[PDB]
Amino acid sequence: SNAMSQQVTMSFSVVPQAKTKDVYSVVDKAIEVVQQSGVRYEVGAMETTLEGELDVLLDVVKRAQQACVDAGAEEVITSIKIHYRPSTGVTIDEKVWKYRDEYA
Amino acid sequence: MSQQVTMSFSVVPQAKTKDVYSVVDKAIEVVQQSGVRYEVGAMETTLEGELDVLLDVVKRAQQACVDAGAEEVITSIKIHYRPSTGVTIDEKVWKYRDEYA
Amino acid sequence: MSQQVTMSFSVVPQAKTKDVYSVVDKAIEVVQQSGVRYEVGAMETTLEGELDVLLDVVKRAQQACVDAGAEEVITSIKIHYRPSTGVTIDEKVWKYRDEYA
Amino acid sequence: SNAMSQQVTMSFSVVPQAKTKDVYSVVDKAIEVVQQSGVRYEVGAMETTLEGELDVLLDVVKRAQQACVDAGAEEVITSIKIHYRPSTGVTIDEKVWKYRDEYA
């Protein structure tokens, strides 16, 4: 894809195995990748939601799982869910607006 | 052995006679009516509470899709289980949301 | 309203004192001992049978991880529900495996 | 990654919405992408397992979900799980051998 492509919405999580680090310490480096990426996101208890260009988002996830390894994880189980609607795109707001009090 | 868990789930219905958002709305209604703490996300809905109670919520959400007209449903679930202390939404997200300042 | 479903699940344990493969082995043992048709895959294990029976299998597999030494477990589940006819493993895979010739 | 990188094992599924096609017809085009890719795979009832290079496998998944759209899907929900162990790699056989009668 490129910056013109219609948006996707995605969620992902990383579950690391680390011999000498606490899980939360390793996960914090994965979330840092998300925080530093520039894309709209929201961290949830089980999954982090992303919105933006497909290839940009997949690269965020790849770098997030690598951040876990760089932080001391020997391995990572990474889960991804993608809502793909390339014709007109899909957004966080269209999926959650009915269900959150912050929306009018 | 705490049965307090955090769980996320989603339902992806097939419904020939319905727009999928309307079907999913009835699944979300089960969650809304349950009494448990929850948050609807773009890809999955997060729940907090007793394992068995939450599993029943998900089962009924799946059934609600069929009752709303779905021919079939693909239901995804993820559970964080930690019986030593239980697991909560706030423990997992406090570092990562502005609302926790 | 057939409750015959196909389900996949996985358990990803944290266990400071154990190699994770050994912990997961005890979860797979619950599946092996259940009596339901199953197949272990690299990323998830597939089950076929009654919805409630299968959910109980997964719950006990998750518990087996803790009993084997896991401090916590992330359990993933996916259910294909189609009460008009039920859903089976063979209906989903027959086109795609050589063993079905 | 490149062809030298240690292997990953991955599973994925596509759940399409198609206004004028049966789900199985659309999914068959996604599995065709897997079949035509050259990588080791196994189709399961809920997920298809892949083994090989990370970027090659992610490209297979991207093309699989696009095949659904080309086949008439208006949108697709795509799920991915990755076992990432870049040091020494991870294989299908190491995870399933104890649990299948075909292994000695």
Sign of CA dihedral A35, A79, D63, D69: negative
Specify whether the CB–CB gap between B77 and B7 falls below 8 A. yes
Answer yes or no: do A79 and D79 touch at CB < 8 A.
Answer: yes
DSSP string for C29-76: HHHHHH-SEEEE-SS-EEEEEEHHHHHHHHHHHHHHHHHTT-SEEEEE
Specify whether the CB–CB gap between D30 and D64 falls below 8 A. yes
What is the amino acid identity at position A25? Answer: S
Specify whether the CB–CB gap between D91 and D37 falls below 8 A. no
CB atoms within 10 A of CB B85: 11
The resolution, in Å, is 1.7
CA angle B34, B38, B40 (to 5 degrees): 115
For position B91, which CATH number holds? Answer: 3.30.70.930
The C-alpha of A55 sits at a distance from chain D's nearest C-alpha, in angstroms, of 9
Contacts of B73 in chain D (CB under 8 A): none
- Give the residue from C51, C59, A32, C94 showing the smallest Cα distance to B73: C51
Specify whether the CB–CB gap between B48 and B9 falls below 8 A. no
Contacts of D90 in chain A (CB under 8 A): 75
Whole-number CA gyration radius for chain B: 15
Which residues are paired to C77 by β-bridges? B77, C9
Residue C43, CA atoms < 13 Å, CB-side half-sphere: 30
- Helical packing angle, A23-37 and A54-70, nearest 10°: 150
CA angle C51, C54, C56 (to 5 degrees): 110
Experimental method: X-ray
Residue D3 dihedral angles phi and psi, to the nearest 5°: -65, -15
Q: Which of B55, B62, B81 sits opposite C73 (nearest CB)?
A: B81
Between the CA of residue B95 and those of A35, A61, B7, B39, C58, what are the distances in Å?
12, 19, 19, 17, 31
Count of domains in chain D? Answer: 1
Between the CA of residue B7 and those of A61, B37, C85, D79, what are the distances in Å?
21, 11, 29, 17
What is the amino acid identity at position C53? Answer: V
CA–CA separation, B16 and B69 (whole Å): 8
A vs D: CB pairs below 8 A:
65
Sign of CA dihedral B26, D19, D79, C97: positive
Q: Is B44 helix (H, G, I), strand (E, B) or coil?
A: coil
Answer yes or no: do D11 and C42 touch at CB < 8 A.
Answer: yes
Beta strand D40-43 with D48-52 is antiparallel
CA angle D79, B57, C59 (to 5 degrees): 70
Q: Is B39 helix (H, G, I), strand (E, B) or coil?
A: strand
Lateral strand order in the sheet of A8-18: A40-43, A48-52, A8-18, A73-84, D73-84, D8-18, D48-52, D40-43
Q: Which residue shows structure tokens 């795609």? A: C96
Contacts of D15 in chain C (CB under 8 A): none
CB atoms within 10 A of CB B49: 20
The encoded tokens of residue A69 equal 């390894």
Answer yes or no: do D28 and C95 touch at CB < 8 A.
Answer: yes
The encoded tokens of residue C101 equal 């010739």
Residue D41 dihedral angles phi and psi, to the nearest 5°: -150, 165
CA–CA separation, D78 and D68 (whole Å): 10
Between the CA of residue D63 and those of A10, A50, B97, D2, D14, what are the distances in Å?
17, 20, 34, 18, 11
Structural domain for C91, as ranges: 2-101
Interface test with B, best of C2, C3, C77 (most B CBs within 10 A): C77
Q: Which residues contact D66 (CB under 8 A, 6 or more apart)?
A: A86
DSSP D98: G
Beta strand C45-50 with C4-14 is antiparallel
